[PDB]
RNA sequence: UAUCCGGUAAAGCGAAUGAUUAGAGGUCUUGGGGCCGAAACGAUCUCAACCUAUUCUCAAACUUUAAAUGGGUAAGAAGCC
RNA sequence: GAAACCUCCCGUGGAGCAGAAGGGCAAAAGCUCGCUUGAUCUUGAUUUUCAGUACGAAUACAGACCGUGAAAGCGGGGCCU
RNA sequence: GUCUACGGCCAUACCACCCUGAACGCGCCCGAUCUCGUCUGAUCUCGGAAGCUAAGCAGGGUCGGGCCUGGUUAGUACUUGGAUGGGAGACCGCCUGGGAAUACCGGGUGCUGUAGGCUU
């Protein structure tokens, strides 16, 4: 009989790190835009790495943060391609989880020889009512303690909500 | 495991930030520029029209700063407004206007400049400001303390500021962030501004919801539907309130007495209680372990 | 031969004390100096506009001018053989009221009280101060118990 | 090779540690500041013989090491290979200098010759713990070790338990109290203060 | 007699910075070498760095502390009311 | 993959602030944007080196003409040396 | 008793975890038509008032860390002035006045200004 300790999805994060720049990245930005229904953001590199073939302030990745119902919907699709399995290590100690998909057309998108097959990266910021405290301007705070989502608590939310297994190893 | 970031050491070397900086209240960078006088002005005050919008309220205070703790010459709250006419939407831009206006009038009534400096009456919305009359006591002048509010176009603080300006305080300002001013053109309507001052932005939303879906309107404007505040009633309501403020701004409080004087709180546990309490935990551990 | 630089050797002087860095708390700014206020100068690291020179830190002097956010302040600086009363324009943040004078004003006020009264009475009262006189004749009662004997203690080597 | 010990004896200069500024310093002769059964428990060695200094003088790293070998050799030969623990309690930190002559006294400032310990009057140089059997064997060990140092140093047997800061008269009771708790060569003094959960680990 | 100024002596390093000894504890890390292992955070040691309490010993160009001696002012008619 | 991008947590500054080092600095003095030319015109006063001359460097004002900000303000080069 | 708004001094006010919060507040909270701003109504801006003290916030708790303040350390370390004092030196003792700092052990754990609530 808890009032608002209702573990919800605060946001869903999606990022395609092509690590190229130019055209490949502009191509991958269309994929997220088709998926999420909003323009994404290009992130640039921190610093040059001659190994990976990247340069400082060169656009490496594209990403986006989905919120609300659309984030619930896209999360659902992403678990369907993963078949509602995660692991213990897929959850972070902070009570967030995430998982890859190897190819976006699995979610439900049409391939093109140009706009190819960008594998991508789901990550779910779980939260509660009254987490905003941390990130507002004026009278800020820290979210107590018996209110912070545990790893265990986030696993059981997944185990209930999306009927998942959380396989061991 | 990792290196403990917050050691003895960490706390020994640690410096707190000021109390109100911790509480997330006082921008001391801005406070210094706002509040201190030029030393050659000496003890002449430096007033500021503080305006803060709470989740359910708008406060308007005039204050100068002394060393004991900035003194408040006058105040007006949005929750007073029921007296004057405003039943609902007390955090809205129109309410902000009333609340500011009321502060000016109440302030002016103290100094006897109620008859001099009527200020703007008809509410155009355009650039207005008070010229001090010669052979008469000059116009009161303070400055707007926005606080931590993101000072954008249409911010409710500037709703209050507009009010106190029309009320007859000379507070300097531009019209670059009254609601009306256009970013991609750079002119000011001052009929858009009037609408906002009169609550027509709210009335139209009320009319838009009722047209589309009854239930959402019923949900959105529940206290507006109770008290029977309708879209077509709205403009009149705020104009009545403006007049009533303008005719009597004086605050009378309530004669508070008949207090039982009882402790809701929990007082501080005395040394000796604390001293025994460990004594009992020490015993209780010993007697407990001498069994299994 | 040492460098003539303005700030040479103020590593410690202009350095906010331990756990008193950051915002210059506001009383400092908002307290009023008139003409002829006795004022002790004490440079500060946070505010670098209007800093006094390292020679006038510690030194007390009188205010002569007061601008918008600073105070002209005559202070006496010795130079080999000659003391030069000279006038410096310190920004408020590096300056306090020197209490040195207030204890004097307290005493003169107390004298004016004790001069007005004791005039109608007739009994004249000691207005001048007097240094601590020798400590008067008095008895000491070794009440019952006798004195406690103190033998010096025998040496031993600890370390 | 190096200068006589004569020439670097009195604590004349300011202390000049190996640092950013003083660099290219040759490594100290002495390195291993303790030897014998150092992996021993407080209980199984309470004697604490010290060689205390009685001159505000500088001791060479060279002379420390030599004194350390001298004492340990005798301790081994006397009682046994694992029957003591010796602690040297002066590390050569001060860097000593050397203006060398093939210009004259122009631009004379030394290169780092070597390191040195500065030792105050009443400061301990070496210290030894072993058994109540073995008092005399330590004394002579420190006695022999004196001859490697310049100046003058008393040999003294402290009123502490082992290399602890606690007076040996009260050491055993304190353990019975659990004021004190064995902790390798040392002993952790527990006080009242800390949360009661620490107190519940003891008494259980 | 009031009142400011100070960062030297000393002291400190279970307080920062840098130095530095030892054992307790720790698969934190991970390794490189082993021994018993096909191999296994399996067992057993080990030495690397890191960390949890302790511990040895230091600083002209480090310091939480912090003297003595020391430098300002002030102690009235150019003042009070 | 030890290093690419994203996300949550801790983080008294252990980063950064053109350069030596010292000081100073966290809803900044750091970073990122928006608008800019106060690095403009003009009297004296003062500080620092000092002989208490110059130079340079700086501090407080004052008068103009601007900038920016809702405003209080800040700005006549570079946080200070 | 206690809160809100603006505060002064800035840890006796910080951090950690634990418990309790009547009324009024303060919040979280529900929305994006308009103002405003985002990749994203998360923040920011704006319009609300169905829920709830879970969190923030307050008050308390902990043989808590930390900070503050006493003791001890110690008349010890240091030190002004003195001697045709000692000592081969290094250094030390006395006279004359001044006099610290850890470890260790106690106690304390925000005070308060202006304006306005609530407990009628
Ligand atoms: Mg501001
Ligand atoms: Mg020879
Ligand atoms: Mg020398
Ligand atoms: Mg110095
Ligand atoms: Mg020293
Ligand atoms: Mg700059
Ligand atoms: Mg000007
Ligand atoms: Mg929202
Ligand atoms: Mg709560
Ligand atoms: Mg609660
Ligand atoms: Mg405590």
CA distances from B225 to B84, B238, B240 (A): 20, 17, 20
Structure solved via: cryo-EM
Pairing assessment for the beta strands D49-53 and D124-129 based on DSSP bridges: antiparallel
**What is the chain B residue with the closest CA to A137?**
B148
Closest-CA residue to D50 (of D123, D111, D116, D133) = D123
* Distance (Å, whole) CA C121 – CA C112: 15
DSSP per-residue letters across B129-163? -PPPPTTSPPPP--EEE-TTS---TT-HHHHHHHH
CA atoms within 13 A on the CB side of A128: 22
Please report which ligand is nearest the Cα atom of C9: 4
- Give residue numbers, 37 to 96 of B, with CB < 7 Å from strand G: 50, 52-57, 59, 61, 63, 65, 67-72, 75, 77, 79, 88-89, 91-94
> Does residue A46 lie within 7 Å of nucleic acid chain F, judged by its CB?
yes
Q: Is the dihedral of CA C119, C124, C129, C135 positive or negative?
A: negative
The contacts of residue D80 (CB under 8 Å, 6+ apart) are none
Question: From the CA atom positions of chain D, what is the Rg in Å?
Answer: 21
Is residue A103 within 8 A of residue A119, CB to CB? The reply is: yes
SS3 track for B167-192? HCCCCCCCCCCCECECCCCCCCCCCH
* Distance (Å, whole) CA C104 – CA D78: 79
> Does residue B250 lie within 7 Å of nucleic acid chain G, judged by its CB?
no
The contacts of residue C60 (CB under 8 Å, 6+ apart) are C38, C39, C40, C41, C75, C98, C100
Pairing assessment for the beta strands B48-53 and B143-145 based on DSSP bridges: parallel
CA distances from A120 to A17, A19, A62, B126, D74 (A): 8, 13, 10, 54, 73
Using CB atoms within 10 A of its CB, is residue B105 exposed (0-12), middle (13-18) or buried (19+)?
Answer: buried
* DSSP state for residue D46 in the 8-state scheme: -
> Does residue B220 lie within 7 Å of nucleic acid chain G, judged by its CB?
yes
Distance B191 CA to ligand 1 centre (A): 29
Residue B212 token pair: 């589309």
- The B residues from 273 to 292 touching D (CB cutoff 8 Å) are 278, 281-282, 285-286, 289
Question: From the CA atom positions of chain B, what is the Rg in Å?
Answer: 26
> Does residue A17 lie within 7 Å of nucleic acid chain F, judged by its CB?
yes
Q: CA angle at residue C38 from C35 to C39, to 5 degrees?
A: 105
Please report which ligand is nearest the Cα atom of D193: 11
Is residue B57 within 8 A of residue B78, CB to CB? The reply is: yes
Continuous segment of H or E residues that includes residue D178: none
**What is the chain A residue with the closest CA to B27?**
A138
> Does residue A125 lie within 7 Å of nucleic acid chain F, judged by its CB?
yes
- What separation, in Å, do the N-terminal and C-terminal C-alpha atoms of chain D show? 63
Spatial strand order in the sheet of A59-66: A41-44, A59-66, A8-17, A120-127, A97-101
Residue with CA nearest F23 C1'? Answer: C11
Name the nucleotide nearest A64; use CA and C1'.
G39
**What is the chain D residue with the closest CA to C158?**
D158
Continuous segment of H or E residues that includes residue A24: helix A23-36
Q: B221 CA to chain A: closest CA distance, Å?
A: 24
CA to C1' distance (Å), from B16 to E66: 25
Helix, strand, or coil (residue D116): strand
**What size, in residues, is chain C?**
159
Q: Give Cα B196 to chain centroid, integer Å.
A: 18
Residue B113 token pair: 């400049």
CA to C1' distance (Å), from B106 to G7: 22
Distance D14 CA to ligand 4 centre (A): 15
Alpha helices in D58-185 (DSSP H): 61-78, 135-146, 168-177
Question: From the CA atom positions of chain A, what is the Rg in Å?
Answer: 18
Exposure b/e, C86-112, CB count within 10 A at least 16 = b:
eebebbbbbbeeeeeeeeeeeeeeeee
Pairing assessment for the beta strands C60-66 and C71-79 based on DSSP bridges: antiparallel
Closest-CA residue to D8 (of D150, D144, D103, D179) = D150
Instruction: Select the residue of C23, C26, C33 nearest B39 (Cβ to Cβ).
Output: C33
> Does residue C22 lie within 7 Å of nucleic acid chain F, judged by its CB?
yes
Q: Is the dihedral of CA B217, B221, B223, B226 positive or negative?
A: negative
Name the nucleotide nearest A44; use CA and C1'.
F5
State the angle between helix axes of A69-82 and A23-36 in degrees (0 to 180), rounded to the nearest 10.
Answer: 110
CA distances from B132 to A36, B37, B279 (A): 59, 22, 74
Closest-CA residue to D59 (of D3, D14, D9, D126) = D9
**What size, in residues, is chain B?**
292
Helix, strand, or coil (residue B215): helix
Continuous segment of H or E residues that includes residue D95: strand D94-98
CA distances from C97 to B78, C26, C91, C94, D20 (A): 43, 15, 14, 11, 44
Helix, strand, or coil (residue B22): helix
* Distance (Å, whole) CA D141 – CA D127: 10
Residue corresponding to tokens 């000659």: C82
Which residues of D fall within a CB distance of 8 Å from B281?
196
> Does residue B152 lie within 7 Å of nucleic acid chain F, judged by its CB?
no
Closest-CA residue to D57 (of D5, D133, D22) = D5
Distance B110 CA to ligand 9 centre (A): 40
Residue A60 token pair: 């490496």
CA distances from B284 to A89, B287, C131, D51 (A): 43, 5, 64, 50
CA distances from D47 to B105, B215, C21, D89, D184 (A): 89, 91, 51, 16, 16
CA to C1' distance (Å), from B191 to F71: 23
Is residue D3 within 8 A of residue D98, CB to CB? The reply is: yes
Is residue A106 within 8 A of residue A99, CB to CB? The reply is: no
CA atoms within 13 A on the CB side of D175: 15
Neighbours of D121 (CB within 10 A): 12
Is residue D139 within 8 A of residue D129, CB to CB? The reply is: no
Q: Which nucleotides of F are covered by protein (CB under 7 A)?
A: 1-13, 22-29, 45-52, 58-62, 69-75, 79-81
CA distances from C68 to A129, B118, B199, C50 (A): 51, 34, 44, 12
Helix, strand, or coil (residue B19): helix
> Does residue A24 lie within 7 Å of nucleic acid chain F, judged by its CB?
no
* Distance (Å, whole) CA B52 – CA B61: 9
Helix, strand, or coil (residue A155): helix
* Distance (Å, whole) CA B247 – CA B105: 9
Binding partners of D (≥3 Cβ pairs within 8 A): B, C
Q: Which pairs from B62-67 meet CB under 8 Å and 24+ separation?
A: B62/B103, B62/B107, B62/B142, B62/B169, B65/B35, B65/B36, B65/C26, B65/C30, B66/C30, B67/C27, B67/C30, B67/C31
Helices (H) and strands (E) in chain C, counts: 1, 5
**What size, in residues, is chain A?**
169
Specify which residues C5 forms β-bridges with. none
Using CB atoms within 10 A of its CB, is residue B97 exposed (0-12), middle (13-18) or buried (19+)?
Answer: buried
Is residue B85 within 8 A of residue B240, CB to CB? The reply is: yes
DSSP per-residue letters across C44-105? -SS--TTPPPTTTSS-EEEEEEE-SS-EEEEEEEEETTEEEEEEEEE-GGGEEE-GGGHHHH
DSSP per-residue letters across B92-106? SHHHHHHHHHHHHHH
Closest-CA residue to A10 (of A64, A62, A63, A71) = A71
Exposure b/e, C145-159, CB count within 10 A at least 16 = b:
eeeeeeeeeeeeeee
Q: Tell me what percent of chain C is helix, strand and coil, each rounded to the nearest 5.
A: 15, 20, 65
Q: CA angle at residue B20 from B19 to B24, to 5 degrees?
A: 125
Exposure b/e, A49-65, CB count within 10 A at least 16 = b:
eeeeebeeeebbbbbbb
Q: Does B22 touch chain A if contact means CB atoms closer than 8 Å?
A: no
Neighbours of B67 (CB within 10 A): 11
Is residue C46 within 8 A of residue C93, CB to CB? The reply is: yes
Q: Is the dihedral of CA B222, B228, B232, B234 positive or negative?
A: negative
Contact criterion met (CB < 8 Å) for B39 and C70? yes
Q: Does A135 touch chain B if contact means CB atoms closer than 8 Å?
A: no
Q: Does D200 touch chain B if contact means CB atoms closer than 8 Å?
A: yes
Residue A83 token pair: 């078949």
Contact criterion met (CB < 8 Å) for B15 and C19? yes
CA to C1' distance (Å), from C108 to E79: 9
Is residue D27 within 8 A of residue D93, CB to CB? The reply is: no
Using CB atoms within 10 A of its CB, is residue C19 exposed (0-12), middle (13-18) or buried (19+)?
Answer: exposed
* Distance (Å, whole) CA D44 – CA D85: 11
* Distance (Å, whole) CA B52 – CA B55: 10
* Distance (Å, whole) CA B198 – CA B122: 12
Neighbours of B41 (CB within 10 A): 13
Alpha helices in chain D (DSSP H): 61-78, 135-146, 168-177, 196-199
Continuous segment of H or E residues that includes residue B67: none
Closest-CA residue to D72 (of D93, D88, D96) = D88
Continuous segment of H or E residues that includes residue D195: none
Q: C11 CA to chain B: closest CA distance, Å?
A: 20
The contacts of residue A142 (CB under 8 Å, 6+ apart) are A133, A134
The contacts of residue B7 (CB under 8 Å, 6+ apart) are none
Spatial strand order in the sheet of B143-145: B72-77, B58-63, B48-53, B143-145
* Distance (Å, whole) CA B139 – CA B133: 8
- Give residue numbers, 78 to 117 of D, with CB < 7 Å from strand G: none
């Amino acid at each position: 009989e808890n009032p608002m300790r209702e573990l919800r999805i605060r946001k869903l994060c999606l990022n395609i790190c092509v690590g190229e720049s130019g055209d490949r990245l502009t191509r991958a930005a269309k994929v997220l835009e088709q998926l999420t229904g909003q323009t994404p953001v290009f992130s640039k590199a921190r610093y040059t790495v001659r190994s990976f073939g990247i340069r400082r302030n060169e656009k490496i990745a594209v990403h986006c943060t989905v919120r609300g119902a659309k984030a619930e919907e896209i999360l659902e699709k992403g678990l369907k391609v993963r078949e509602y399995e995660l692991r213990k290590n897929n959850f972070s100690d902070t009570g967030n989880f995430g998982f890859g998909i190897q190819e976006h057309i699995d979610l439900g998108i049409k391939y093109d020889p140009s706009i190819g097959i960008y594998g991508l990266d789901f990550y779910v910021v779980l939260g509660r009512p009254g987490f905003s405290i941390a990130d507002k301007k004026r009278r800020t705070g820290c979210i107590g303690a018996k209110h912070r989502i545990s790893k265990e608590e986030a696993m059981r939310w997944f185990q209930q909500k999306y009927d998942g297994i959380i396989l061991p190893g | 495991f990792v290196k403990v970031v917050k050691n003895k050491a960490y706390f020994k070397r640690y410096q707190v930030k000021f109390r109100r900086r911790r509480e997330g209240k006082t921008d001391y960078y801005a406070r210094k520029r706002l509040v201190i006088q030029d030393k050659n002005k000496y003890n002449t005050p430096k007033y500021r029209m503080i305006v803060r919008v709470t989740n359910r309220d708008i406060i308007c205070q005039i204050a100068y700063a002394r060393i004991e703790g900035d003194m408040i010459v006058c105040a007006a709250y949005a929750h007073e407004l029921p007296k004057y006419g405003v039943k609902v939407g007390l955090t809205n831009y129109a309410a902000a206007y009333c609340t500011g206006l009321l502060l000016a009038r109440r302030l002016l009534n103290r100094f006897g400049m109620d008859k001099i400096y009527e200020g703007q009456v008809e509410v155009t919305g355009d650039e207005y400001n008070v010229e001090s009359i010669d052979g008469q006591p000059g116009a009161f002048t303070c400055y707007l303390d926005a606080g931590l509010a993101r000072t954008t176009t249409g911010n409710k603080v500037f709703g209050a500021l507009k009010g106190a300006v029309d009320g007859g305080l000379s507070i300097p300002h531009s019209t670059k962030r009254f609601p009306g001013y256009d970013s991609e053109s750079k002119e000011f309507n001052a009929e858009v501004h009037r609408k906002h001052i009169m609550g027509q932005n709210v009335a139209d939303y009320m009319r838009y919801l009722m047209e589309e879906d009854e239930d959402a309107y019923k949900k959105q404007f529940s206290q507006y539907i109770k008290n029977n505040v309708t879209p077509d009633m709205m403009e009149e309501m705020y104009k009545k309130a403006h007049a009533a403020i303008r005719e009597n701004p004086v605050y009378e409080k309530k004669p508070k007495r008949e207090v039982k004087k009882k402790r809701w709180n929990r007082p501080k546990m005395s040394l000796a209680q604390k001293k025994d309490r460990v004594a009992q935990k020490k015993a209780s551990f010993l007697r407990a372990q001498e069994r299994a | 031969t040492n460098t003539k630089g303005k700030r040479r050797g103020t590593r410690y002087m202009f350095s906010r004390p331990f756990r008193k860095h950051g915002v210059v708390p506001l009383a400092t700014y908002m307290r009023i100096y008139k003409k002829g206020d006795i004022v002790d100068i004490k440079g500060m690291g946070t505010v670098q506009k209007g800093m006094p020179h390292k020679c006038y830190h510690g030194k007390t002097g009188r205010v002569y001018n007061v601008t918008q956010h600073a105070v002209g302040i005559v202070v006496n600086k010795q130079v080999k053989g000659k003391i030069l009363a000279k006038r410096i324009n310190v920004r408020i943040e590096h300056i306090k009221h020197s209490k040195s004078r207030d204890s004097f004003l307290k005493r003169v006020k107390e004298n004016d009280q004790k001069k007005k009264e004791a005039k109608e009475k007739g009994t004249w009262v000691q207005l001048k101060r007097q240094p601590a006189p020798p400590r008067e004749a008095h008895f000491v009662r070794t009440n019952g118990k006798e004195p406690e004997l103190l033998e010096p203690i025998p040496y031993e080597f600890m370390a | 090779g190096r200068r006589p010990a004569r020439c670097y004896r009195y604590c004349k200069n300011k202390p000049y540690p190996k640092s950013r500024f003083c660099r290219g310093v040759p490594d100290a002769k002495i390195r291993i500041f303790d030897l014998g059964r150092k992996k021993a428990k407080v209980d199984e060695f309470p004697l604490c013989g010290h060689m205390v200094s009685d001159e505000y003088e500088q001791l060479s790293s060279e002379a420390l090491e030599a004194a350390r070998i001298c004492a340990n050799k005798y301790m081994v030969k006397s009682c046994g290979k694992d029957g003591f623990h010796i602690r040297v309690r002066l590390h050569p930190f001060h860097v000593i200098r050397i203006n060398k002559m093939l210009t004259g006294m122009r631009g004379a400032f030394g290169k780092p010759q070597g390191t040195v310990a500065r030792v105050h009057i009443g400061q301990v140089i070496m210290s030894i713990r072993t058994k109540l059997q073995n008092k005399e064997h330590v004394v002579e060990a420190l006695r022999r070790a004196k001859f490697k140092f310049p100046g003058r140093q008393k040999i003294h047997i402290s009123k502490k338990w082992g290399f602890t800061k606690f007076n040996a008269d009260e050491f055993e009771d304190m353990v019975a109290e659990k004021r004190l708790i064995p902790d390798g060569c040392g002993v952790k003094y527990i006080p009242n203060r800390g949360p009661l959960d620490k107190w519940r680990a003891l008494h259980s």
